[PDB]
Structures are given as structure tokens and as C-alpha cells.
Symmetry: C2
Subunit: 145 residues, 2 copies
């Protein structure tokens, strides 16, 4: 019963929302752990890091149900059944970010008078272009053998 | 002041995207691992570290600008505030979000998915309690 079709269901949408929240929880808790680290709270830092592993398990399980239910990647709306498809999903999202999202964010940051945040968004646009090209070169290797 | 700007929203959306990218690439790496593509797995893992740096830098600008946590809309300036943000999100998840998802899954005919969401509700309740015990240790 693991392969029941989830397309068009509310449950499909709920898996995507769960994946988003679990992804953020891991990042948040590892960021908070660094504050605990600096201040000298190793037990708190360690708890944050261990709970973060929990949120990894939660996120990965949501992606298993997404993949098995015939759903697409929460970030890109691309299929992620095969390794080739996974890499194509990575390329699609990186391409969105370097062609559109980060340059757009930089332009708006400059307009609103946040040049330091704009510089950061421009760095990230260049970074996601580098990422897209490296994934493009790997895909070429996969599809060539 | 970043509060109420479009740049504040774009930092929040950047954080969301970057958080998902790290999770996605580490998940994809496991498939590369199984199939015998260590260079592809390694690349996914190294790029994933890039996306960690991106997400953390978004949180730096958020925290420095006095903006709230993307996940909870709670302040994250101090360690105590960070633990309070963790508690608020976990409490929403176990009291509302996961039980609600479970009910919808059951009602749509997906018992296995519902069981998963009920597991996660219990897990987030355990997380919340462990964070509440941390906050007691700090605030006291
Ligand atoms: Cl401690
Ligand atoms: Co089955
Ligand atoms: Co979780
Ligand atoms: Co990237
Ligand atoms: Co990134
Ligand atoms: Co949790």
C-alpha cells in the first residue's frame, strides 16, 4: 500500500508543508547550537544537534512518502524518482535561483537601501550559477555513462 | 530598519529555499551512495555545505536586523529566545499541525501516511518537553 497515488490530495500538500517545516527546523537548531557553543552550554548544544537529527529523519521520511506517492520535489515541482531526475531537480532549482530569485532579491535590496544584503544576494546568485554548472557536468556524465 | 520591507520577506524566502536545498541534496546523496557514484555523492554533500552557509547567512541578517524566525515569527536574538522559538514551533506541530495532517490522511484513505504523521506528533511533543527543560535550566 506504499505506492497509493497521492496526486491531487490534501495529504500531498501536507507532506510538502511538513517537508518545508522539517527542513527549516534542522537549519534553525544547528544555528542555535552555535550560540550555545560560544556561550559554554555543551549539553544544550548537543541536545539541539540530536533533535536536529530527528528533524532530518522527519524530512527524509516526508520525501520518501512524496516519491512513493507519485509526487514532485517540494522545491521545484520536478519528479525525483531516479538519480538522474534528482540531479535535474537540483539543476532546475539552482537555475531559478541564479537566473531570477537572487538577482531579483539583490535589485530590491539595493532599491530599499540595503547594499550589504544586496552584496550577499549577488554572492549567492554567483554561487548558485557555479552549483548549476557543476550539477550540469555531472548529469552529462550520468547520461553518457 | 529591515522590519516591514520586501528585503525582510526575501531573507525569509531565501532561508526557506536554502533549508530545503540542504535537505534535498543530502537525500539525493544517499541514492548516489547506493548506486556507486561517490563523486556525485561527494559533490551533493559539498554543495549542501554551501547551502548551510547560505541559510545561516540569511539568519545572520535576520537576527542582526531584529527580524523574527522564519518558522515561528518569534525573536531569535538571545539563546533563551532561540529556545523559546524552538518550543513554539514544536508546540504548534504536536498540538495542531501533525494531528491535523494525520486526520486528513486517515479521511483521504492513507492510513500509512496518517501513522507517520501520528509518530511525528508524538516526536515533536517529546522535543517540546526536552526544550522546555532547557529553558528552565537557562531562565533559572
Ligand atoms: Cl549546557
Ligand atoms: Co505498498
Ligand atoms: Co520534526
Ligand atoms: Co545551490
Ligand atoms: Co544556496
Ligand atoms: Co521537533
Amino acid at each position: 500500500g506504499h505506492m497509493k497515488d497521492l496526486k491531487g490530495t490534501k495529504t500531498a500538500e501536507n507532506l510538502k508543508q511538513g517537508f518545508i517545516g522539517e527542513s527549516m527546523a534542522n537549519r534553525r537548531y544547528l544555528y542555535f547550537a552555535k550560540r550555545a557553543d560560544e556561550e559554554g552550554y555543551p549539553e544544550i548544544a548537543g541536545l539541539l544537534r540530536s533533535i536536529a537529527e530527528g528533524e532530518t529523519a522527519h524530512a527524509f521520511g516526508h520525501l520518501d512518502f512524496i516519491r512513493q506517492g507519485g509526487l514532485t520535489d517540494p522545491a521545484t515541482d520536478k519528479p525525483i524518482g531516479t538519480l538522474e531526475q534528482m540531479i535535474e531537480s537540483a539543476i532546475a532549482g539552482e537555475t531559478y535561483e541564479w537566473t531570477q530569485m537572487y538577482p531579483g532579491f539583490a535589485k530590491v535590496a539595493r532599491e530599499e537601501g540595503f547594499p550589504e544584503v544586496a552584496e550577499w544576494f549577488e554572492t549567492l546568485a554567483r554561487a548558485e550559477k557555479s552549483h548549476a554548472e557543476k550539477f550540469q557536468n555531472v548529469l552529462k556524465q550520468l547520461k553518457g555513462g
